[PDB]
Amino acid sequence: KAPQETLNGGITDMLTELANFEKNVSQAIHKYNAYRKAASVIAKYPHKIKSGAEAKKLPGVGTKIAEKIDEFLATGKLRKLEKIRQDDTSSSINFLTRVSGIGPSAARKFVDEGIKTLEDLRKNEDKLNHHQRIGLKYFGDFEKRIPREEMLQMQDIVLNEVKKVDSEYIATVCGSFRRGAESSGDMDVLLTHPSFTSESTKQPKLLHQVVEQLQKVHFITDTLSKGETKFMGVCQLPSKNDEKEYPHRRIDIRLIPKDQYYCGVLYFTGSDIFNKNMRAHALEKGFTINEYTIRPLGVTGVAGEPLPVDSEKDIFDYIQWKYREPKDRSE
DNA sequence: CCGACCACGCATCAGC
DNA sequence: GCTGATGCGTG
DNA sequence: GTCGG
Ligand code: NA
Ligand code: NA
């Protein structure tokens, strides 16, 4: 259960501001992740926070952020946040990572050499790798939400495309859209194939061959990166005659070995808390989960040798849990 | 006081 | 050339 | 930054 707008949003936003900043311009992924947990926890909390101490009571809140909340509540802002927002560097630095393939090193990099806008990006492409190029490109496309409907449409081709290449292949979208969402971030595509398994001899062809299918039939425009296991590229929808070209959407495909699909499948599908709580449970029954397997948790504290999973149900079954639908993998 | 915080593929980058 | 490490991005 | 050894 989650309410939250006129509730805590102010707080939750100054927070995320805070996070991004730490990431992007400070290079504190941990500190970044904190602020994130914090803001998230508060996002959930059914009340209107009246004090720092009040929030402190929360699991991620602590003194420093608690203090923040007091300055916010009282003043209606955060001095710190104002300078930063006013700060040239931090800003250009902030913005610049909005571009895919740019991180904080690059971003801080560019920015030093006086590069700091889109234009400078525009007028210096020589100084950008491919990944960074494709996203200088599709900047705007990149910050767009994907409408599961389009998504649906999306779902077809890939399903079909692969259907042709091989009948035995196994594709199944995942991520948010599996989670019945009404608007995704990108299409996530999970796939495998019979001839593809752990201890087996990995056939590059598999991923290879399929990206090409989707390539052949103009589904995938650009390419961010590729390897035997997973493809990170761009895709597009057949523009309907006299209907304006949709945007270009990020997509990723994932090739997995038969013996560890489902866990992977399982794992991928999330959600976040979903993973957190399940792993906890699977433990109680005496097991330890990850992205590839499940193993009988030792009689001595820790023990190996994974179990044979042939379905998400199979997994659920080991930990003695109801085959949860993806729809409700809320946690 | 002080380490942990998810693991992991691929691309580029430092080095040798 | 190859190796190993560091950037970036993903569910 | 927070939480925990
Ligand atoms: Na707390
Ligand atoms: Na970025």
Side-chain angles (χ1 to χ4, degrees):
Chain A
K1 183 189 190 276
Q4 65 202 203
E5 275 203 4
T6 158
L7 252 189
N8 300 117
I11 287 169
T12 338
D13 301 341
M14 76 169 317
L15 278 211
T16 292
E17 190 140 336
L18 255 28
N20 286 323
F21 176 101
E22 294 281 310
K23 189 167 71 148
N24 309 153
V25 182
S26 278
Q27 315 192 63
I29 300 85
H30 295 307
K31 277 213 190 182
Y32 155 80
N33 289 106
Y35 273 125
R36 13 172 37 201
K37 118 266 85 160
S40 72
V41 314
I42 105 153
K44 285 221 152 212
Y45 177 81
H47 298 293
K48 185 203 169 180
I49 302 152
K50 292 271 302 181
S51 73
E54 174 194 359
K56 188 152 193 312
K57 136 211 177 146
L58 294 297
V61 188
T63 153
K64 318 194 77 169
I65 285 171
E67 319 183 41
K68 302 216 166 95
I69 318 211
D70 291 0
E71 200 200 10
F72 188 45
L73 251 22
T75 66
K77 255 175 213 161
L78 211 71
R79 224 189 48 87
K80 170 187 190 71
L81 222 51
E82 88 177 356
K83 160 204 141 158
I84 289 156
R85 289 161 168 174
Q86 73 61 92
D87 178 79
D88 313 88
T89 35
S90 139
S91 313
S92 350
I93 307 202
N94 247 139
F95 175 53
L96 234 46
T97 77
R98 299 178 44 189
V99 171
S100 192
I102 299 190
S105 30
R108 180 186 298 246
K109 162 184 46 156
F110 288 142
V111 177
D112 295 19
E113 46 186 14
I115 294 199
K116 79 192 58 187
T117 52
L118 218 163
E119 305 71 48
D120 322 330
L121 295 161
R122 290 271 156 66
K123 16 160 198 155
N124 288 285
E125 56 280 303
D126 70 358
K127 27 201 97 60
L128 280 236
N129 56 231
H130 193 43
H131 203 269
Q132 324 197 115
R133 279 184 275 89
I134 289 74
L136 177 25
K137 194 172 191 185
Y138 310 118
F139 191 83
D141 296 358
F142 293 156
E143 299 186 336
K144 302 217 153 145
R145 298 218 46 94
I146 301 182
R148 143 192 298 268
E149 243 294 16
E150 285 188 4
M151 281 253 186
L152 288 191
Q153 219 181 304
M154 312 197 168
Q155 102 172 303
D156 207 341
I157 302 142
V158 354
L159 274 283
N160 322 230
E161 299 333 277
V162 319
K163 184 69 158 73
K164 300 147 202 152
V165 25
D166 212 336
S167 160
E168 301 185 344
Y169 262 125
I170 295 166
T172 146
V173 189
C174 289
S176 31
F177 162 107
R178 207 170 87 118
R179 321 195 301 258
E182 83 315 330
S183 110
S184 305
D186 51 345
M187 159 152 276
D188 321 343
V189 179
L190 222 315
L191 168 98
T192 79
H193 180 295
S195 80
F196 189 24
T197 217
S198 308
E199 42 56 46
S200 65
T201 305
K202 82 310 206 304
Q203 86 169 350
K205 315 77 148 168
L206 293 162
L207 180 67
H208 186 79
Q209 115 192 6
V210 285
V211 187
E212 287 190 350
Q213 192 53 238
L214 289 126
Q215 277 171 321
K216 189 182 181 194
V217 69
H218 306 66
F219 185 45
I220 287 146
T221 90
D222 325 25
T223 295
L224 302 308
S225 65
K226 155 201 25 44
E228 136 92 37
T229 54
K230 92 171 178 305
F231 167 103
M232 270 221 29
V234 183
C235 64
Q236 192 174 53
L237 265 194
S239 183
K240 202 160 156 176
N241 209 166
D242 142 59
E243 269 295 348
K244 196 169 165 153
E245 286 212 314
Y246 303 112
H248 291 91
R249 344 226 98 169
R250 279 280 297 89
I251 176 180
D252 289 295
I253 312 194
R254 283 152 306 187
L255 173 56
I256 308 192
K258 191 154 197 177
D259 65 81
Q260 47 208 252
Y261 204 18
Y262 302 97
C263 321
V265 162
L266 179 53
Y267 166 58
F268 278 101
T269 329
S271 93
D272 221 19
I273 56 257
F274 179 95
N275 273 165
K276 306 189 166 193
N277 297 131
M278 166 168 188
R279 295 199 171 191
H281 177 68
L283 230 305
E284 296 328 311
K285 309 326 147 93
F287 320 101
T288 180
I289 313 290
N290 56 188
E291 49 273 4
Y292 329 70
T293 49
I294 185 181
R295 295 170 295 166
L297 199 21
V299 44
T300 77
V302 285
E305 197 61 343
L307 270 33
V309 197
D310 283 79
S311 188
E312 320 193 30
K313 175 59 177 180
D314 290 15
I315 288 179
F316 286 125
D317 308 23
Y318 301 149
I319 63 162
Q320 39 219 178
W321 260 17
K322 77 151 294 302
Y323 187 158
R324 277 249 210 145
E325 276 190 347
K327 212 268 273 295
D328 31 20
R329 291 179 189 176
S330 51
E331 41 202 339

Short mmCIF file of all heavy atoms in Angstrom, two decimals, chain A residues 23-24 94-104 107 131, chain C residues 8-10, ligand 2:
data_model
loop_
_atom_site.label_atom_id
_atom_site.label_comp_id
_atom_site.label_asym_id
_atom_site.label_seq_id
_atom_site.Cartn_x
_atom_site.Cartn_y
_atom_site.Cartn_z
N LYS A 23 25.66 11.13 -6.33
CA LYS A 23 26.05 10.20 -7.37
C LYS A 23 26.99 10.92 -8.34
O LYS A 23 28.23 10.81 -8.26
CB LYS A 23 24.78 9.87 -8.13
CG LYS A 23 24.97 8.76 -9.09
CD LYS A 23 23.65 8.19 -9.66
CE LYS A 23 22.89 9.10 -10.63
NZ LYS A 23 22.14 8.37 -11.67
N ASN A 24 26.31 11.68 -9.23
CA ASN A 24 26.75 12.52 -10.34
C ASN A 24 27.90 13.45 -10.05
O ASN A 24 28.90 13.43 -10.75
CB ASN A 24 25.61 13.40 -10.84
CG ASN A 24 24.35 12.62 -11.14
OD1 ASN A 24 23.21 13.17 -11.06
ND2 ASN A 24 24.54 11.33 -11.50
N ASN A 94 25.55 17.92 -13.30
CA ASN A 94 24.36 17.15 -13.05
C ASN A 94 23.74 16.72 -14.38
O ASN A 94 23.73 15.51 -14.67
CB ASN A 94 23.35 17.75 -12.00
CG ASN A 94 23.16 16.95 -10.66
OD1 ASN A 94 23.06 17.54 -9.53
ND2 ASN A 94 23.00 15.61 -10.81
N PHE A 95 23.30 17.73 -15.19
CA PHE A 95 22.66 17.56 -16.50
C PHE A 95 23.29 16.54 -17.46
O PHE A 95 22.66 15.53 -17.90
CB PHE A 95 22.69 18.93 -17.17
CG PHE A 95 22.18 18.82 -18.56
CD1 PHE A 95 20.94 18.22 -18.79
CD2 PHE A 95 22.93 19.31 -19.63
CE1 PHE A 95 20.43 18.11 -20.07
CE2 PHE A 95 22.43 19.20 -20.93
CZ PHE A 95 21.19 18.60 -21.14
N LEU A 96 24.58 16.81 -17.74
CA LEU A 96 25.40 15.97 -18.61
C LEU A 96 25.22 14.48 -18.41
O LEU A 96 25.36 13.76 -19.38
CB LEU A 96 26.89 16.34 -18.42
CG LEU A 96 27.69 16.70 -19.69
CD1 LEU A 96 26.98 17.70 -20.66
CD2 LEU A 96 29.09 17.22 -19.31
N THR A 97 24.96 13.97 -17.17
CA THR A 97 24.81 12.51 -17.01
C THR A 97 23.46 12.05 -17.42
O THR A 97 23.19 10.81 -17.51
CB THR A 97 25.00 12.15 -15.58
OG1 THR A 97 23.74 12.59 -15.15
CG2 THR A 97 26.03 13.13 -14.97
N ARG A 98 22.59 13.07 -17.69
CA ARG A 98 21.30 12.64 -18.14
C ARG A 98 21.49 11.94 -19.45
O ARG A 98 20.66 11.17 -19.87
CB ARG A 98 20.42 13.80 -18.28
CG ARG A 98 20.29 14.46 -16.95
CD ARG A 98 19.46 15.69 -16.97
NE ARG A 98 18.25 15.47 -17.76
CZ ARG A 98 17.46 16.52 -18.05
NH1 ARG A 98 17.76 17.78 -17.61
NH2 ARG A 98 16.37 16.24 -18.78
N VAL A 99 22.63 12.18 -20.11
CA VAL A 99 22.93 11.52 -21.37
C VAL A 99 23.40 10.06 -21.16
O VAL A 99 24.24 9.83 -20.31
CB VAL A 99 24.00 12.27 -22.14
CG1 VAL A 99 24.41 11.43 -23.33
CG2 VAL A 99 23.52 13.63 -22.67
N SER A 100 22.86 9.08 -21.92
CA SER A 100 23.24 7.67 -21.77
C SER A 100 24.62 7.39 -22.27
O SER A 100 24.92 7.63 -23.42
CB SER A 100 22.28 6.67 -22.40
OG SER A 100 22.51 5.31 -22.01
N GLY A 101 25.42 6.86 -21.37
CA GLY A 101 26.81 6.50 -21.58
C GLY A 101 27.66 7.51 -20.85
O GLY A 101 28.86 7.37 -20.76
N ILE A 102 27.04 8.56 -20.32
CA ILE A 102 27.86 9.51 -19.60
C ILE A 102 27.58 9.26 -18.17
O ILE A 102 26.45 9.04 -17.75
CB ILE A 102 27.71 11.01 -19.85
CG1 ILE A 102 28.02 11.36 -21.29
CG2 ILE A 102 28.45 11.90 -18.81
CD1 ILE A 102 28.11 12.87 -21.49
N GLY A 103 28.66 9.29 -17.46
CA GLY A 103 28.61 9.08 -16.08
C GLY A 103 29.29 10.28 -15.60
O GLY A 103 29.51 11.24 -16.35
N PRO A 104 29.62 10.19 -14.34
CA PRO A 104 30.27 11.23 -13.60
C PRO A 104 31.72 11.39 -13.91
O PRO A 104 32.28 12.47 -13.68
CB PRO A 104 29.89 11.05 -12.11
CG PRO A 104 28.98 9.80 -12.06
CD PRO A 104 28.89 9.20 -13.46
N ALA A 107 31.29 13.10 -17.39
CA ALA A 107 30.65 14.35 -17.03
C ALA A 107 31.57 15.29 -16.30
O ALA A 107 31.63 16.49 -16.52
CB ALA A 107 29.38 14.14 -16.27
N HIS A 131 28.51 4.58 -27.49
CA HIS A 131 27.45 4.63 -26.51
C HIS A 131 27.16 6.06 -26.26
O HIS A 131 26.02 6.44 -26.50
CB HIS A 131 27.79 4.06 -25.13
CG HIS A 131 26.57 3.62 -24.33
ND1 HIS A 131 25.89 4.47 -23.44
CD2 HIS A 131 25.95 2.39 -24.32
CE1 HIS A 131 24.89 3.75 -22.94
NE2 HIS A 131 24.90 2.51 -23.45
P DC C 8 31.67 7.52 -16.05
OP1 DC C 8 31.77 8.57 -17.13
OP2 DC C 8 31.52 7.97 -14.66
"O5'" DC C 8 30.61 6.38 -16.45
"C5'" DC C 8 30.43 6.03 -17.69
"C4'" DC C 8 29.29 5.05 -17.85
"O4'" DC C 8 29.67 3.71 -17.57
"C3'" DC C 8 27.95 5.31 -17.17
"O3'" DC C 8 26.90 5.47 -18.15
"C2'" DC C 8 27.62 4.03 -16.43
"C1'" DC C 8 28.53 2.99 -17.10
N1 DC C 8 28.95 1.84 -16.25
C2 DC C 8 28.77 0.57 -16.74
O2 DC C 8 28.22 0.51 -17.83
N3 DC C 8 29.18 -0.50 -16.02
C4 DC C 8 29.74 -0.26 -14.83
N4 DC C 8 30.16 -1.32 -14.10
C5 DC C 8 29.95 1.06 -14.33
C6 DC C 8 29.55 2.08 -15.07
P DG C 9 25.47 5.89 -17.61
OP1 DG C 9 24.62 6.67 -18.57
OP2 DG C 9 25.83 6.53 -16.32
"O5'" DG C 9 24.88 4.41 -17.62
"C5'" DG C 9 24.86 3.78 -18.86
"C4'" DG C 9 24.10 2.48 -18.89
"O4'" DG C 9 24.73 1.47 -18.08
"C3'" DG C 9 22.74 2.66 -18.27
"O3'" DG C 9 21.87 1.73 -18.95
"C2'" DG C 9 22.92 2.23 -16.82
"C1'" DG C 9 23.88 1.06 -16.98
N9 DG C 9 24.72 0.78 -15.86
C8 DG C 9 25.27 1.76 -15.09
N7 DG C 9 26.02 1.23 -14.14
C5 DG C 9 25.93 -0.21 -14.35
C6 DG C 9 26.57 -1.33 -13.65
O6 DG C 9 27.37 -1.33 -12.69
N1 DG C 9 26.26 -2.56 -14.19
C2 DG C 9 25.43 -2.70 -15.24
N2 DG C 9 25.25 -3.99 -15.57
N3 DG C 9 24.84 -1.68 -15.94
C4 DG C 9 25.13 -0.47 -15.42
P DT C 10 20.34 1.76 -18.51
OP1 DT C 10 19.44 1.34 -19.62
OP2 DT C 10 20.23 3.03 -17.75
"O5'" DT C 10 20.12 0.45 -17.67
"C5'" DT C 10 19.90 -0.62 -18.57
"C4'" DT C 10 19.62 -1.90 -17.86
"O4'" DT C 10 20.78 -2.32 -17.08
"C3'" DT C 10 18.47 -1.73 -16.91
"O3'" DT C 10 17.36 -2.39 -17.41
"C2'" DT C 10 18.93 -2.32 -15.60
"C1'" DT C 10 20.35 -2.75 -15.83
N1 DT C 10 21.20 -2.28 -14.79
C2 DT C 10 21.87 -3.27 -14.13
O2 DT C 10 21.73 -4.47 -14.44
N3 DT C 10 22.67 -2.79 -13.10
C4 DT C 10 22.85 -1.46 -12.78
O4 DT C 10 23.57 -1.04 -11.88
C5 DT C 10 22.16 -0.53 -13.49
C7 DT C 10 22.42 0.85 -12.95
C6 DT C 10 21.32 -0.93 -14.47
NA NA E 2 24.35 8.94 -17.74
#
